Symmetry: D2
Subunit: 137 residues, 4 copies
């Protein structure tokens, strides 16, 4: 089969966000290995600058290990952790994709140019994401 490695970059600050990341992960598991930052032992609010540093390095690793970075763009604004991770993964030449069901945008003209142009594709639904993934490989 070959199971590509996927890193889900996504806000994880309330249970709706965390339940929604699980949904995306369960939808991809028959395709791809999925790293989920919220399930990777280290979560902040549960040692301040050492927890921060531990979270940071664990995320950098997981990004380096992945083939794909899926960035969840939903929210009143695009989360800054997600944007940073999107730019880092682009610069080390990962395949970069966006997931966006939200009606809100940065400006009437859509997402920021650095988000819109770094994602090869931005998807509004999981099925299109899954078919696009299978044709890419």
């Amino acid at each position: 089969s070959f199971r590509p490695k996927l890193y889900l970059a996504a806000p994880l600050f309330n249970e709706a966000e965390k339940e929604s990341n699980r949904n995306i992960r369960d939808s991809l598991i028959d395709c791809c290995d999925v790293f989920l930052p919220q399930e990777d032992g280290l979560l902040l609010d549960e040692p301040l600058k050492v927890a921060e540093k531990s979270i940071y390095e664990a995320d950098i690793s997981a990004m380096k290990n992945a083939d794909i970075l899926l960035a969840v763009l939903d929210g009143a604004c695009i989360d800054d952790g997600v944007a940073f991770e999107l730019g880092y993964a682009k610069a080390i030449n990962k395949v970069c994709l966006g997931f966006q069901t939200d009606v809100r945008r940065q400006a009437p003209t859509g997402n920021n140019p650095m988000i819109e142009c770094s994602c090869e594709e931005i998807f509004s639904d999981l099925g299109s994401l899954k078919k696009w993934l299978q044709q890419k490989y």
Copy 2:
């Protein structure tokens, strides 16, 4: 060595932000060559975004220093992208922040907080700090 290469990652969406960024540039233009995205119709959207994007990537590759202005209701997603991109290609990443606001009561998101070598709250200290690093 020459004058160091500062790229200014900053929100530029109203006239306050644009003036704020000109103020930052004018104070550094003794230390560093400064790239301001806002200064450096009949345009189809997709090729517009591409050219703005490509030029910023190219400027970022050509910088020694990325300075990320972290102020605002949210940290700008353009700024946060540029920080991650610059950090992955091993630039010097600094933050500038004057807002009282944060993501959570624990501070900035750890990716922003741990990727900036330092975050400054006043230009004088930032400028002097760069001066010590490069003599």
Copy 3:
């Protein structure tokens, strides 16, 4: 004395937000009767219609429940909170987000504007019964 009328002021911009609102409403439908704005032609006329619909629905409400979660507190939620407080409804917040405005918590207009802010649907419904009897 019948069932109290409750207005759910919440962001409704994606299916996760819309589902989460439905879950708040379902949890409360034994206590109270819940107006759900997501459950209730040019755009200049569509705005004032939603506006008037919502305004009228807050005026006929007893309780305003404002969910504060998000990268920012939604501006509509914030508008509805202040509009409901000025006409003397009971104003309550619901907040599961670990995020705040400052490292000192919510904006004080929000913090003192709400009479209490809950993190469980459990504790909130208990407060209301022990309030009304």
Copy 4:
């Protein structure tokens, strides 16, 4: 000489300087209350902003920002409810949705102004 309440974010010195640019701009037409100039610490902050909002004729809410500020929006709503003339000032090219501002904001503001020259001129008629 109406009394005017500036609903404005005030969390960095760019925002605060920008506020005083608005208020100094209009101090020939109207009196302006600036919240940045004028447990229990938050309660006092609360009690004073509402009583100042009460004494105002006009609420002008600056909408610029990556979000419309919740404090500003709270006061916009409060001010509309007790029947002030509510207006907006928006220079930011950002919007909530690609269809403009939230309908609670757009329709509670009688007019949304792009520059102070227009705002200045509109209050001449009122």
